PDB file of C-alpha atoms in Angstrom:
ATOM      1  CA  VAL A   1      -0.017  -0.026  -0.048  1.00 33.56           C
ATOM      2  CA  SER A   2       2.974   2.396   0.512  1.00 34.47           C
ATOM      3  CA  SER A   3       3.284   2.740  -3.137  1.00 32.91           C
ATOM      4  CA  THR A   4      -0.591   2.589  -3.493  1.00 32.81           C
ATOM      5  CA  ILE A   5      -1.648   5.694  -1.531  1.00 32.92           C
ATOM      6  CA  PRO A   6      -2.185   8.605  -3.930  1.00 34.87           C
ATOM      7  CA  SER A   7      -0.296  11.876  -3.458  1.00 32.01           C
ATOM      8  CA  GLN A   8      -1.826  14.638  -1.461  1.00 30.52           C
ATOM      9  CA  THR A   9      -4.682  12.347  -0.636  1.00 32.49           C
ATOM     10  CA  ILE A  10      -5.464  11.407   2.915  1.00 30.18           C
ATOM     11  CA  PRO A  11      -6.557   7.567   3.158  1.00 30.88           C
ATOM     12  CA  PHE A  12     -10.034   6.770   4.903  1.00 29.28           C
ATOM     13  CA  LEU A  13      -8.270   4.876   7.672  1.00 27.87           C
ATOM     14  CA  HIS A  14      -5.243   6.768   8.853  1.00 25.34           C
ATOM     15  CA  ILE A  15      -3.035   6.969  12.077  1.00 28.29           C
ATOM     16  CA  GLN A  16      -2.796  10.419  13.221  1.00 26.84           C
ATOM     17  CA  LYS A  17       0.385  11.769  15.037  1.00 27.78           C
ATOM     18  CA  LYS A  18       0.325  14.603  17.556  1.00 26.92           C
ATOM     19  CA  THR A  19       2.391  17.671  16.843  1.00 26.24           C
ATOM     20  CA  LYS A  20       2.108  21.312  18.070  1.00 27.00           C
ATOM     21  CA  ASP A  21      -0.900  22.117  15.974  1.00 26.82           C
ATOM     22  CA  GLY A  22      -2.622  19.068  17.335  1.00 26.49           C
ATOM     23  CA  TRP A  23      -3.306  15.541  15.851  1.00 26.36           C
ATOM     24  CA  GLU A  24      -2.745  15.404  12.108  1.00 25.91           C
ATOM     25  CA  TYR A  25      -2.417  12.753   9.426  1.00 25.90           C
ATOM     26  CA  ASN A  26       1.014  11.240   9.266  1.00 24.28           C
ATOM     27  CA  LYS A  27       1.775   9.418   6.185  1.00 24.16           C
ATOM     28  CA  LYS A  28       4.416   6.860   7.264  1.00 21.51           C
ATOM     29  CA  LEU A  29       2.446   5.830  10.254  1.00 24.01           C
ATOM     30  CA  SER A  30      -0.899   5.371   8.377  1.00 27.00           C
ATOM     31  CA  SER A  31       1.105   3.473   5.719  1.00 26.58           C
ATOM     32  CA  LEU A  32       2.480   1.259   8.431  1.00 26.55           C
ATOM     33  CA  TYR A  33      -1.130   0.610   9.582  1.00 25.26           C
ATOM     34  CA  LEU A  34      -2.361  -0.068   6.093  1.00 24.50           C
ATOM     35  CA  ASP A  35       0.464  -2.467   5.325  1.00 26.83           C
ATOM     36  CA  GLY A  36      -0.415  -4.504   8.416  1.00 29.02           C
ATOM     37  CA  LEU A  37      -3.929  -4.479   7.002  1.00 29.05           C
ATOM     38  CA  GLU A  38      -2.659  -6.069   3.762  1.00 34.56           C
ATOM     39  CA  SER A  39      -0.887  -8.668   6.028  1.00 32.19           C
ATOM     40  CA  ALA A  40      -4.167  -9.172   7.678  1.00 29.99           C
ATOM     41  CA  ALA A  41      -5.904  -9.430   4.364  1.00 26.91           C
ATOM     42  CA  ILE A  42      -3.679 -11.719   2.219  1.00 27.29           C
ATOM     43  CA  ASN A  43      -2.384 -13.603   5.255  1.00 24.53           C
ATOM     44  CA  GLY A  44      -4.332 -12.667   8.302  1.00 24.44           C
ATOM     45  CA  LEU A  45      -3.655 -11.815  12.008  1.00 30.03           C
ATOM     46  CA  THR A  46      -1.958 -13.679  14.757  1.00 30.66           C
ATOM     47  CA  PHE A  47      -3.345 -13.370  18.154  1.00 34.32           C
ATOM     48  CA  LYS A  48      -1.799 -16.141  20.298  1.00 35.77           C
TER      49      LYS A  48
ATOM     50  CA  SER B   1     -90.033  32.514 -19.779  1.00 35.09           C
ATOM     51  CA  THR B   2     -89.640  28.697 -19.199  1.00 34.78           C
ATOM     52  CA  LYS B   3     -86.785  26.170 -20.031  1.00 29.83           C
ATOM     53  CA  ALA B   4     -86.907  22.520 -19.165  1.00 24.44           C
ATOM     54  CA  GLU B   5     -84.073  20.091 -19.482  1.00 22.99           C
ATOM     55  CA  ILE B   6     -84.107  16.252 -18.201  1.00 24.42           C
ATOM     56  CA  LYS B   7     -81.100  15.323 -16.023  1.00 23.85           C
ATOM     57  CA  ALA B   8     -81.637  11.670 -14.849  1.00 21.07           C
ATOM     58  CA  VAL B   9     -83.771   8.746 -15.591  1.00 23.94           C
ATOM     59  CA  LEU B  10     -82.888   6.176 -13.056  1.00 21.32           C
ATOM     60  CA  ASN B  11     -84.122   2.509 -12.562  1.00 21.21           C
ATOM     61  CA  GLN B  12     -84.397   2.123  -8.850  1.00 18.99           C
ATOM     62  CA  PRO B  13     -86.351  -0.814  -7.198  1.00 16.11           C
ATOM     63  CA  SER B  14     -89.179   1.692  -6.861  1.00 17.11           C
ATOM     64  CA  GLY B  15     -89.281   2.261 -10.650  1.00 16.18           C
ATOM     65  CA  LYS B  16     -88.124   5.007 -12.983  1.00 12.95           C
ATOM     66  CA  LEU B  17     -87.022   8.191 -11.119  1.00 15.15           C
ATOM     67  CA  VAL B  18     -87.396  11.044 -13.780  1.00 15.86           C
ATOM     68  CA  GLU B  19     -85.260  13.948 -12.768  1.00 12.33           C
ATOM     69  CA  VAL B  20     -86.319  17.233 -14.379  1.00 15.69           C
ATOM     70  CA  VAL B  21     -84.462  20.380 -13.230  1.00 14.72           C
ATOM     71  CA  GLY B  22     -86.045  22.774 -15.904  1.00 13.30           C
ATOM     72  CA  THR B  23     -84.839  26.306 -15.143  1.00 13.29           C
ATOM     73  CA  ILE B  24     -86.644  29.644 -15.574  1.00 14.42           C
ATOM     74  CA  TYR B  25     -85.289  32.753 -17.670  1.00 14.43           C
ATOM     75  CA  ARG B  26     -86.373  36.159 -17.477  1.00 11.88           C
ATOM     76  CA  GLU B  27     -85.057  37.497 -20.753  1.00 13.91           C
ATOM     77  CA  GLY B  28     -81.829  35.427 -20.741  1.00 14.29           C
ATOM     78  CA  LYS B  29     -80.694  35.681 -17.175  1.00  9.55           C
ATOM     79  CA  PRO B  30     -81.593  32.489 -15.154  1.00 10.44           C
ATOM     80  CA  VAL B  31     -83.971  33.195 -12.290  1.00  8.81           C
ATOM     81  CA  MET B  32     -84.764  29.866 -10.804  1.00  8.53           C
ATOM     82  CA  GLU B  33     -83.544  26.364 -10.965  1.00  8.55           C
ATOM     83  CA  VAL B  34     -86.647  24.121 -10.048  1.00  9.52           C
ATOM     84  CA  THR B  35     -85.894  20.633  -9.745  1.00  9.05           C
ATOM     85  CA  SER B  36     -88.496  18.092  -9.572  1.00  9.65           C
ATOM     86  CA  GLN B  37     -88.608  14.154  -9.353  1.00 13.39           C
ATOM     87  CA  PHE B  38     -91.252  11.835 -10.736  1.00 13.74           C
ATOM     88  CA  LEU B  39     -91.404   8.233  -9.968  1.00 18.18           C
ATOM     89  CA  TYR B  40     -93.036   5.539 -12.150  1.00 21.76           C
ATOM     90  CA  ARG B  41     -93.852   3.302  -9.446  1.00 22.56           C
ATOM     91  CA  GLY B  42     -93.273  -0.359 -10.397  1.00 23.93           C
ATOM     92  CA  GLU B  43     -90.212  -2.185 -11.597  1.00 23.83           C
ATOM     93  CA  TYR B  44     -88.495  -1.504 -14.907  1.00 20.78           C
ATOM     94  CA  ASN B  45     -85.385  -3.266 -16.383  1.00 22.95           C
ATOM     95  CA  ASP B  46     -84.642  -1.083 -19.399  1.00 24.57           C
ATOM     96  CA  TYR B  47     -81.238   0.182 -18.711  1.00 22.26           C
ATOM     97  CA  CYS B  48     -79.972   1.323 -22.129  1.00 21.99           C
ATOM     98  CA  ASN B  49     -82.678   4.184 -21.856  1.00 20.24           C
ATOM     99  CA  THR B  50     -81.139   5.052 -18.445  1.00 25.93           C
ATOM    100  CA  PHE B  51     -78.674   7.886 -17.528  1.00 23.24           C
ATOM    101  CA  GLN B  52     -77.853  10.519 -14.786  1.00 19.93           C
ATOM    102  CA  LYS B  53     -76.139  13.731 -15.818  1.00 23.03           C
ATOM    103  CA  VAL B  54     -75.461  15.235 -12.434  1.00 20.48           C
ATOM    104  CA  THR B  55     -73.648  18.529 -12.111  1.00 22.33           C
ATOM    105  CA  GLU B  56     -71.190  18.709  -9.340  1.00 26.20           C
ATOM    106  CA  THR B  57     -70.937  21.584  -6.672  1.00 28.56           C
ATOM    107  CA  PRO B  58     -67.869  23.758  -6.052  1.00 27.38           C
ATOM    108  CA  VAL B  59     -66.207  20.912  -4.245  1.00 27.40           C
ATOM    109  CA  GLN B  60     -63.023  21.712  -2.148  1.00 23.97           C
ATOM    110  CA  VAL B  61     -60.483  19.111  -1.414  1.00 23.82           C
ATOM    111  CA  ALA B  62     -58.289  19.297   1.584  1.00 22.54           C
ATOM    112  CA  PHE B  63     -54.463  19.315   1.368  1.00 22.55           C
ATOM    113  CA  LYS B  64     -51.484  20.961   3.000  1.00 24.57           C
ATOM    114  CA  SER B  65     -48.192  19.722   1.404  1.00 24.77           C
ATOM    115  CA  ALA B  66     -46.027  19.587  -1.833  1.00 25.50           C
ATOM    116  CA  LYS B  67     -47.248  16.048  -2.570  1.00 25.82           C
ATOM    117  CA  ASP B  68     -50.401  17.519  -3.639  1.00 26.71           C
ATOM    118  CA  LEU B  69     -48.729  18.348  -6.879  1.00 27.98           C
ATOM    119  CA  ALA B  70     -47.610  14.753  -7.378  1.00 27.21           C
ATOM    120  CA  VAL B  71     -51.132  13.526  -6.541  1.00 25.07           C
ATOM    121  CA  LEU B  72     -52.777  15.863  -9.067  1.00 23.95           C
ATOM    122  CA  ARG B  73     -50.131  14.836 -11.749  1.00 25.17           C
ATOM    123  CA  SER B  74     -50.892  11.133 -10.840  1.00 26.95           C
ATOM    124  CA  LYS B  75     -54.462  11.736 -11.779  1.00 25.22           C
ATOM    125  CA  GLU B  76     -54.583  10.954 -15.607  1.00 23.07           C
ATOM    126  CA  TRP B  77     -58.034  12.598 -15.970  1.00 22.01           C
ATOM    127  CA  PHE B  78     -56.693  16.089 -14.850  1.00 22.36           C
ATOM    128  CA  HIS B  79     -55.076  18.292 -17.491  1.00 20.07           C
ATOM    129  CA  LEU B  80     -52.664  21.194 -16.646  1.00 20.98           C
ATOM    130  CA  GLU B  81     -54.604  24.331 -17.427  1.00 18.69           C
ATOM    131  CA  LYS B  82     -53.064  26.939 -15.127  1.00 19.61           C
ATOM    132  CA  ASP B  83     -49.445  27.909 -14.074  1.00 17.95           C
ATOM    133  CA  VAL B  84     -49.700  28.402 -10.158  1.00 17.96           C
ATOM    134  CA  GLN B  85     -48.464  26.139  -7.339  1.00 19.70           C
ATOM    135  CA  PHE B  86     -51.133  23.620  -6.039  1.00 21.18           C
ATOM    136  CA  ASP B  87     -52.144  23.070  -2.368  1.00 26.45           C
ATOM    137  CA  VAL B  88     -55.926  22.774  -2.599  1.00 25.39           C
ATOM    138  CA  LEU B  89     -58.916  22.516  -5.106  1.00 27.72           C
ATOM    139  CA  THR B  90     -62.352  24.037  -5.254  1.00 27.80           C
ATOM    140  CA  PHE B  91     -63.564  22.392  -8.620  1.00 29.95           C
ATOM    141  CA  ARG B  92     -67.031  23.315 -10.030  1.00 32.06           C
ATOM    142  CA  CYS B  93     -67.360  19.999 -11.905  1.00 33.11           C
ATOM    143  CA  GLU B  94     -70.178  18.220 -13.824  1.00 33.53           C
ATOM    144  CA  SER B  95     -70.322  14.648 -14.846  1.00 29.68           C
ATOM    145  CA  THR B  96     -72.836  12.127 -17.003  1.00 33.96           C
ATOM    146  CA  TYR B  97     -73.474   8.661 -15.866  1.00 37.29           C
ATOM    147  CA  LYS B  98     -74.867   5.689 -18.050  1.00 34.37           C
ATOM    148  CA  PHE B  99     -76.319   2.655 -16.110  1.00 33.30           C
ATOM    149  CA  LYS B 100     -76.098  -0.823 -17.527  1.00 34.28           C
ATOM    150  CA  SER B 101     -77.365  -2.326 -14.308  1.00 34.63           C
ATOM    151  CA  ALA B 102     -78.564  -1.282 -10.824  1.00 33.23           C
ATOM    152  CA  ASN B 103     -75.390   0.246  -9.605  1.00 32.69           C
ATOM    153  CA  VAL B 104     -72.659  -0.339 -12.155  1.00 30.38           C
ATOM    154  CA  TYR B 105     -72.264   2.371 -14.731  1.00 27.27           C
ATOM    155  CA  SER B 106     -71.882   1.504 -18.321  1.00 30.56           C
ATOM    156  CA  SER B 107     -69.833   4.659 -18.995  1.00 30.13           C
ATOM    157  CA  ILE B 108     -68.680   7.954 -17.268  1.00 28.74           C
ATOM    158  CA  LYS B 109     -68.204  11.325 -18.847  1.00 30.42           C
ATOM    159  CA  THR B 110     -66.702  14.202 -16.813  1.00 27.96           C
ATOM    160  CA  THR B 111     -65.551  17.599 -17.970  1.00 28.18           C
ATOM    161  CA  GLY B 112     -65.773  19.948 -14.974  1.00 25.87           C
ATOM    162  CA  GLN B 113     -63.453  22.991 -14.282  1.00 26.63           C
ATOM    163  CA  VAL B 114     -60.478  23.722 -12.204  1.00 26.78           C
ATOM    164  CA  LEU B 115     -60.059  26.138  -9.407  1.00 28.38           C
ATOM    165  CA  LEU B 116     -57.473  27.404  -6.847  1.00 30.00           C
ATOM    166  CA  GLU B 117     -56.578  30.621  -5.181  1.00 30.58           C
ATOM    167  CA  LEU B 118     -54.859  33.483  -7.204  1.00 33.26           C
ATOM    168  CA  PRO B 119     -52.157  36.033  -6.274  1.00 31.23           C
ATOM    169  CA  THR B 120     -53.276  38.930  -4.013  1.00 28.65           C
ATOM    170  CA  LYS B 121     -56.922  37.928  -3.765  1.00 27.02           C
ATOM    171  CA  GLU B 122     -57.387  39.016  -7.314  1.00 26.09           C
ATOM    172  CA  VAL B 123     -58.967  36.071  -9.124  1.00 27.44           C
ATOM    173  CA  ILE B 124     -59.256  35.512 -12.959  1.00 27.89           C
ATOM    174  CA  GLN B 125     -60.209  32.878 -15.495  1.00 25.86           C
ATOM    175  CA  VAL B 126     -59.438  29.146 -15.093  1.00 30.29           C
ATOM    176  CA  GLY B 127     -59.553  25.867 -16.906  1.00 29.19           C
ATOM    177  CA  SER B 128     -61.059  22.482 -17.038  1.00 31.86           C
ATOM    178  CA  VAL B 129     -60.695  18.663 -16.880  1.00 31.36           C
ATOM    179  CA  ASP B 130     -61.581  15.565 -18.893  1.00 29.71           C
ATOM    180  CA  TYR B 131     -62.483  11.963 -18.171  1.00 28.23           C
ATOM    181  CA  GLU B 132     -64.089   8.753 -19.641  1.00 29.84           C
ATOM    182  CA  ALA B 133     -64.675   5.450 -18.317  1.00 26.87           C
ATOM    183  CA  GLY B 134     -66.708   2.167 -18.874  1.00 27.89           C
ATOM    184  CA  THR B 135     -68.278  -0.476 -16.677  1.00 27.39           C
ATOM    185  CA  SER B 136     -67.272   1.299 -13.463  1.00 25.38           C
ATOM    186  CA  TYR B 137     -68.740   1.143  -9.984  1.00 27.77           C
ATOM    187  CA  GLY B 138     -68.029   5.025  -9.256  1.00 28.76           C
ATOM    188  CA  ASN B 139     -66.584   8.039 -10.597  1.00 28.45           C
ATOM    189  CA  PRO B 140     -63.046   8.684  -9.773  1.00 28.16           C
ATOM    190  CA  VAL B 141     -63.158  12.504 -10.163  1.00 28.01           C
ATOM    191  CA  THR B 142     -66.303  13.253  -7.895  1.00 27.49           C
ATOM    192  CA  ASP B 143     -65.248  10.570  -5.300  1.00 28.90           C
ATOM    193  CA  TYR B 144     -61.783  12.039  -5.136  1.00 28.61           C
ATOM    194  CA  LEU B 145     -62.893  15.579  -4.722  1.00 27.13           C
ATOM    195  CA  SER B 146     -65.203  14.473  -1.874  1.00 28.54           C
ATOM    196  CA  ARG B 147     -62.816  12.110  -0.229  1.00 27.60           C
ATOM    197  CA  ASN B 148     -60.421  14.821   0.238  1.00 28.08           C
ATOM    198  CA  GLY B 149     -63.077  16.865   1.792  1.00 27.98           C
ATOM    199  CA  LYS B 150     -66.508  18.305   1.662  1.00 27.40           C
ATOM    200  CA  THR B 151     -67.579  21.047  -0.899  1.00 29.06           C
ATOM    201  CA  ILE B 152     -67.728  24.910  -0.254  1.00 28.65           C
ATOM    202  CA  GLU B 153     -70.065  24.318   2.676  1.00 31.04           C
ATOM    203  CA  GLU B 154     -71.722  27.403   3.953  1.00 29.95           C
ATOM    204  CA  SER B 155     -73.770  25.151   6.193  1.00 29.44           C
ATOM    205  CA  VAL B 156     -72.402  23.940   9.537  1.00 29.41           C
ATOM    206  CA  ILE B 157     -75.175  22.474  11.800  1.00 29.53           C
ATOM    207  CA  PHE B 158     -75.803  24.225  15.197  1.00 27.89           C
ATOM    208  CA  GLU B 159     -75.183  22.171  18.188  1.00 28.78           C
ATOM    209  CA  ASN B 160     -78.663  21.558  19.723  1.00 25.09           C
ATOM    210  CA  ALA B 161     -82.231  22.131  18.630  1.00 25.85           C
ATOM    211  CA  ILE B 162     -84.791  24.612  20.196  1.00 27.84           C
ATOM    212  CA  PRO B 163     -88.293  25.264  18.878  1.00 29.41           C
ATOM    213  CA  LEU B 164     -89.036  28.113  16.468  1.00 30.48           C
ATOM    214  CA  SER B 165     -92.885  28.201  16.043  1.00 31.02           C
ATOM    215  CA  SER B 166     -93.767  24.834  17.520  1.00 29.37           C
ATOM    216  CA  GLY B 167     -97.464  24.266  18.569  1.00 26.99           C
ATOM    217  CA  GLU B 168    -100.948  24.356  17.380  1.00 29.57           C
ATOM    218  CA  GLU B 169    -100.485  27.834  15.689  1.00 32.78           C
ATOM    219  CA  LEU B 170     -98.389  26.183  12.937  1.00 33.31           C
TER     220      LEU B 170
ATOM    221  CA  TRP C   1     -20.196   5.620  10.364  1.00 30.09           C
ATOM    222  CA  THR C   2     -20.900   1.946  11.125  1.00 30.17           C
ATOM    223  CA  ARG C   3     -24.012   0.190   9.507  1.00 28.12           C
ATOM    224  CA  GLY C   4     -25.290  -2.444  11.861  1.00 26.53           C
ATOM    225  CA  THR C   5     -28.469  -3.995  12.963  1.00 26.05           C
ATOM    226  CA  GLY C   6     -30.205  -2.787  16.119  1.00 25.26           C
ATOM    227  CA  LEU C   7     -30.982   0.839  17.003  1.00 25.60           C
ATOM    228  CA  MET C   8     -29.073   2.338  14.047  1.00 29.01           C
ATOM    229  CA  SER C   9     -31.150   0.635  11.349  1.00 29.89           C
ATOM    230  CA  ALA C  10     -32.871   3.993  10.870  1.00 28.14           C
ATOM    231  CA  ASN C  11     -29.684   5.804   9.842  1.00 24.78           C
ATOM    232  CA  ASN C  12     -28.592   3.410   7.353  1.00 29.29           C
ATOM    233  CA  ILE C  13     -30.799   4.716   4.687  1.00 30.62           C
ATOM    234  CA  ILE C  14     -28.517   7.905   4.120  1.00 31.76           C
ATOM    235  CA  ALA C  15     -25.258   5.866   4.088  1.00 30.03           C
ATOM    236  CA  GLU C  16     -25.525   5.655   0.424  1.00 27.14           C
ATOM    237  CA  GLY C  17     -25.983   9.353   0.125  1.00 26.12           C
ATOM    238  CA  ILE C  18     -22.869  10.295   2.125  1.00 22.19           C
ATOM    239  CA  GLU C  19     -20.776   7.695   0.423  1.00 22.21           C
ATOM    240  CA  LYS C  20     -21.358   9.431  -2.927  1.00 22.93           C
ATOM    241  CA  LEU C  21     -19.427  12.349  -1.601  1.00 25.40           C
ATOM    242  CA  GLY C  22     -16.123  10.546  -1.558  1.00 23.85           C
ATOM    243  CA  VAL C  23     -16.693   9.512   1.887  1.00 23.34           C
ATOM    244  CA  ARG C  24     -17.182   5.732   2.743  1.00 25.16           C
ATOM    245  CA  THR C  25     -19.279   4.143   5.443  1.00 27.49           C
ATOM    246  CA  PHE C  26     -18.418   0.950   7.186  1.00 29.21           C
ATOM    247  CA  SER C  27     -20.278  -2.368   7.908  1.00 29.85           C
ATOM    248  CA  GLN C  28     -19.654  -4.121  11.340  1.00 29.76           C
ATOM    249  CA  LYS C  29     -17.234  -6.576   9.843  1.00 29.05           C
ATOM    250  CA  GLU C  30     -15.136  -3.823   8.263  1.00 27.70           C
ATOM    251  CA  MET C  31     -14.909  -1.890  11.471  1.00 26.05           C
ATOM    252  CA  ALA C  32     -14.063  -5.087  13.282  1.00 24.88           C
ATOM    253  CA  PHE C  33     -11.328  -5.516  10.667  1.00 26.06           C
ATOM    254  CA  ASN C  34      -9.943  -2.015  11.039  1.00 27.89           C
ATOM    255  CA  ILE C  35      -9.775  -2.198  14.814  1.00 28.64           C
ATOM    256  CA  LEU C  36      -8.327  -5.787  14.715  1.00 27.70           C
ATOM    257  CA  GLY C  37      -5.644  -4.144  12.417  1.00 26.72           C
ATOM    258  CA  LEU C  38      -4.712  -2.020  15.498  1.00 24.81           C
ATOM    259  CA  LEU C  39      -3.638  -5.158  17.188  1.00 22.70           C
ATOM    260  CA  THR C  40      -0.951  -5.991  14.608  1.00 19.00           C
ATOM    261  CA  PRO C  41       2.556  -6.581  16.172  1.00 17.59           C
ATOM    262  CA  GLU C  42       3.664  -3.295  14.659  1.00 17.06           C
ATOM    263  CA  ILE C  43       0.999  -1.154  15.828  1.00 17.99           C
ATOM    264  CA  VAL C  44       1.209  -2.910  19.255  1.00 15.36           C
ATOM    265  CA  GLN C  45       4.934  -2.117  19.390  1.00 15.46           C
ATOM    266  CA  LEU C  46       4.253   1.403  18.159  1.00 15.15           C
ATOM    267  CA  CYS C  47       1.733   1.920  21.074  1.00 14.46           C
ATOM    268  CA  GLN C  48       4.366   1.289  23.819  1.00 13.79           C
ATOM    269  CA  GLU C  49       6.267   4.165  22.348  1.00 16.88           C
ATOM    270  CA  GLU C  50       3.521   6.697  21.430  1.00 18.16           C
ATOM    271  CA  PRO C  51      -0.300   6.846  22.220  1.00 20.85           C
ATOM    272  CA  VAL C  52      -2.133   6.186  18.928  1.00 22.33           C
ATOM    273  CA  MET C  53      -5.029   8.052  17.444  1.00 22.70           C
ATOM    274  CA  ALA C  54      -6.448   5.692  14.759  1.00 20.82           C
ATOM    275  CA  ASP C  55      -8.903   7.904  12.799  1.00 19.68           C
ATOM    276  CA  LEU C  56     -10.982   5.099  11.387  1.00 19.33           C
ATOM    277  CA  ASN C  57     -13.460   7.751  10.198  1.00 19.19           C
ATOM    278  CA  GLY C  58     -13.947   7.251   6.556  1.00 20.25           C
ATOM    279  CA  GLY C  59     -13.557  10.933   5.714  1.00 21.60           C
ATOM    280  CA  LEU C  60     -16.641  12.205   7.567  1.00 20.49           C
ATOM    281  CA  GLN C  61     -14.408  14.905   9.075  1.00 20.31           C
ATOM    282  CA  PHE C  62     -14.311  16.675   5.727  1.00 20.11           C
ATOM    283  CA  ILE C  63     -17.971  17.169   5.494  1.00 19.47           C
ATOM    284  CA  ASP C  64     -19.042  20.693   6.582  1.00 22.24           C
ATOM    285  CA  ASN C  65     -21.967  20.565   8.842  1.00 17.49           C
ATOM    286  CA  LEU C  66     -22.481  16.765   9.065  1.00 19.86           C
ATOM    287  CA  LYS C  67     -25.651  16.952  11.086  1.00 20.45           C
ATOM    288  CA  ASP C  68     -27.516  19.271   8.568  1.00 20.25           C
ATOM    289  CA  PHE C  69     -26.190  17.215   5.496  1.00 15.22           C
ATOM    290  CA  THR C  70     -27.475  14.010   7.061  1.00 14.34           C
ATOM    291  CA  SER C  71     -30.718  15.703   8.227  1.00 14.18           C
ATOM    292  CA  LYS C  72     -31.459  17.104   4.671  1.00 14.51           C
ATOM    293  CA  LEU C  73     -30.481  13.725   2.997  1.00 15.58           C
ATOM    294  CA  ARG C  74     -32.987  12.045   5.398  1.00 17.58           C
ATOM    295  CA  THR C  75     -35.625  14.708   4.717  1.00 17.96           C
ATOM    296  CA  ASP C  76     -35.059  14.134   1.019  1.00 16.53           C
ATOM    297  CA  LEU C  77     -35.398  10.518   1.158  1.00 17.71           C
ATOM    298  CA  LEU C  78     -38.473  10.499   3.385  1.00 16.01           C
ATOM    299  CA  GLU C  79     -40.170  13.138   1.345  1.00 14.64           C
ATOM    300  CA  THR C  80     -39.574  11.083  -1.686  1.00 16.39           C
ATOM    301  CA  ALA C  81     -40.743   7.751  -0.349  1.00 17.01           C
ATOM    302  CA  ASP C  82     -43.860   9.084   1.392  1.00 15.42           C
ATOM    303  CA  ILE C  83     -45.117  10.677  -1.532  1.00 14.47           C
ATOM    304  CA  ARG C  84     -44.464   7.707  -3.700  1.00 16.11           C
ATOM    305  CA  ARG C  85     -46.404   5.590  -1.165  1.00 15.94           C
ATOM    306  CA  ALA C  86     -49.158   8.190  -1.123  1.00 16.29           C
ATOM    307  CA  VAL C  87     -49.593   8.462  -4.925  1.00 18.81           C
ATOM    308  CA  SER C  88     -49.789   4.622  -4.970  1.00 16.99           C
ATOM    309  CA  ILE C  89     -52.377   4.571  -2.127  1.00 17.56           C
ATOM    310  CA  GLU C  90     -54.504   7.052  -3.902  1.00 16.31           C
ATOM    311  CA  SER C  91     -54.205   5.278  -7.242  1.00 17.23           C
ATOM    312  CA  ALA C  92     -55.285   2.006  -5.519  1.00 17.08           C
ATOM    313  CA  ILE C  93     -58.248   3.842  -3.930  1.00 16.68           C
ATOM    314  CA  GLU C  94     -59.173   5.026  -7.444  1.00 15.16           C
ATOM    315  CA  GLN C  95     -58.880   1.672  -8.924  1.00 13.32           C
ATOM    316  CA  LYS C  96     -60.988   0.191  -6.174  1.00 11.44           C
ATOM    317  CA  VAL C  97     -63.668   2.904  -6.607  1.00  9.32           C
TER     318      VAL C  97
END
């Protein structure tokens, strides 16, 4: 997904990071979430 | 002068109900309506020679919404002959029945007229409607106008009765 | 915006409307998937270092006056559906007459 997220476009499901102005969309952190979501879709989630 | 015109010839279980509403003219301008009913007591089955051309009253429907336009459009008999928003009717209509049996009508003919309020209480001319049918148990137009509400009724009945000139001096 | 059975079955009828702005609504399985994606080993390790806001809202934050937008969408749907039901009811009455 890192190569899939369009430029200047905020994905629907995004992890926010807190800076001085407040919580804002952070691209690398949201991409880390979305790649885990790929791993959960193609392979799944481990919960043991 | 005089002017007679047959309106209805009904076949009820009491017999033919001749309906004559011959009006009266004093040089052109109508003066009196004068409706009379005669009844050929007996039992008659001739239904081809049976009809009832009733004229309707200024019947007012009851509505308050914008669905009113949609309902009026849905009526295939109504034809658009005005350019003002719809919320209520006061049609002065008139129809023509043809009986093929005791209650069922061989055909229906309705032409009527259309009514609704105009700008600043300054009303001018209006348009009309049209309808035909066949082998029907009722008239859609009149029943619709009535079902939404009663006509222009300048008659609301008083609550309780008291005497006026009751006694033996009447 | 989550679409489920229960007491929110009355707000599902506008979900299609909002979704055609470029926002997306979620079913209950989709929000299960999204929140279970917060339990991945990387997000879990990322929570031991930093508290994590996960905006799983599907873009509903970009709609100005969401309350009024949803209210007028619902009003439009209701005022279409009721008049459609009523025209049909009146036509059925006419046909029975």
